[PDB]
Amino acid sequence: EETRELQSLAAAVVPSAQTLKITDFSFSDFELSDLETALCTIRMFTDLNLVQNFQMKHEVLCRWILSVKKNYRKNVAYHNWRHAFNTAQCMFAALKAGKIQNKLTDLEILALLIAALSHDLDHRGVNNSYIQRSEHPLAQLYCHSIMEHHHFDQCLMILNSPGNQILSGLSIEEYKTTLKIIKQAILATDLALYIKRRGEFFELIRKNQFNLEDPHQKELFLAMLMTACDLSAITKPWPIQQRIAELVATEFFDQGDREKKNKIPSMQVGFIDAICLQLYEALTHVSEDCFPLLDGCRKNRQKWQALAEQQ
Numbered sequence: 001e002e003t004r005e006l007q008s009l010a011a012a013v014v015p016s017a018q019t020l021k022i023t024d025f026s027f028s029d030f031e032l033s034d035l036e037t038a039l040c041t042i043r044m045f046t047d048l049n050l051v052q053n054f055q056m057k058h059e060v061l062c063r064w065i066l067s068v069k070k071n072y073r074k075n076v077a078y079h080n081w082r083h084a085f086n087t088a089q090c091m092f093a094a095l096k097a098g099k100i101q102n103k104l105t106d107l108e109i110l111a112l113l114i115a116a117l118s119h120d121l122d123h124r125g126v127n128n129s130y131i132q133r134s135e136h137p138l139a140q141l142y143c144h145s146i147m148e149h150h151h152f153d154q155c156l157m158i159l160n161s162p163g164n165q166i167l168s169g170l171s172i173e174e175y176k177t178t179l180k181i182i183k184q185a186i187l188a189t190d191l192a193l194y195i196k197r198r199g200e201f202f203e204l205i206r207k208n209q210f211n212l213e214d215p216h217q218k219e220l221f222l223a224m225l226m227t228a229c230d231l232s233a234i235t236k237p238w239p240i241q242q243r244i245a246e247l248v249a250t251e252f253f254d255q256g257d258r259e260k261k262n263k264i265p266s267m268q269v270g271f272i273d274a275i276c277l278q279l280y281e282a283l284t285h286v287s288e289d290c291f292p293l294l295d296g297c298r299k300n301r302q303k304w305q306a307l308a309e310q311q
């Protein structure tokens with residue numbers, strides 16, 4: 001923690017969502033400094049009316065954002081602060097440009113944004129031996145989303161740290177509801193849970209039976225939305241997706257957590273087909289304004305496929 005970094009963040013004027021470009025599905029953070037990602041984050045909370053509706057104190061939100069950023073590991077090639085930051089930006093864009101904002105409640109929106117930013121806290125890279133070196137090396141077989149539970153634990157720890165309580169303004173009832181949604185959302189980032197609950201979601205959309213007014217369906221939708229934002233790097237403009245794919249490959253193969261290069265194109269195509277396409281197609285069914293995510297995904301598949309055939 002840098003009181004210096006906080007002082008500078010808290011005293012800065014937060015530029016518009018327009019100037020920060022956070023309403024664009026094509027948004028990229030390569031050009032941004034950490035302070036700038038912090039300012040973008042404040043703007044996300046502000047334009048979603050969260051600061052106002054939940055009486056968040058400026059200095060507290062600033063301190064919370066810095067604490068969250070500080071708890072991601074920079075030595076992890078992909079699952080780091082920038083990835084969490086980008087997931088939250090996608091959530092913002094889907095809520096605003098994608099018009100999903102009108103379909104949810106303020107608490108659900110509050111929970112989703114916090115969850116997007118916090119869902120990978122303390123991530124140590126896909127090739128970590130966290131559980132492998134614990135007193136329960138078999139835990140993952142009992143509780144597969146055990147690491148996601150740990151990410152949530154980190155999130156809660158920060159929300160309860162002195163000077164970082166951005167939810168202090170909620171009533172105990174609002175608070176309990178928000179924490180529950182935040183938990184579900186973070187657990188939802190366990191790709192295994194996504195694969196397990198996909199079918200039901202695709203089925204409903206398919207048979208035109210999808211109804212957000214149904215408490216079970218709304219919860220399912222929140223989980224699907226979390227996945228959509230968490231994988232959104234796959235939807236970015238070609239030059240940006242190439243760079244993001246480089247980071248993922250690094251974490252995956254060069255243990256950049258704490259040959260393949262020629263197989264990467266086909267790998268990405270397989271990933272897009274097996275995991276991404278269906279999800280983004282389903283999302284567009286719920287809200288056509290989310291089409292750019294689907295469009296971007298398709299364009300990247302075309303690009304990777306061309307390379308796969310080797311140019």
Ligand SMILES: CCCc1nn(C)c2c(=O)[nH]c(-c3cc(S(N)(=O)=O)sc3OCC)nc12
Nearest residue numbers: 231232233234245248249264267268270271
């Ligand atoms: C936790 C990883 C999920 C993920 N997110 N993103 C954005 C990506 C991505 O772009 N690519 C991959 C991915 C998946 C495979 S495979 N064939 O095992 O399903 S290979 C790969 O990245 C290759 C560099 N995986 C991901």
Ligand SMILES: [Mg+2]
Nearest residue numbers: 079120123189
């Ligand atoms: Mg993760």
Ligand SMILES: [Zn+2]
Nearest residue numbers: 119120189230
């Ligand atoms: Zn993630």
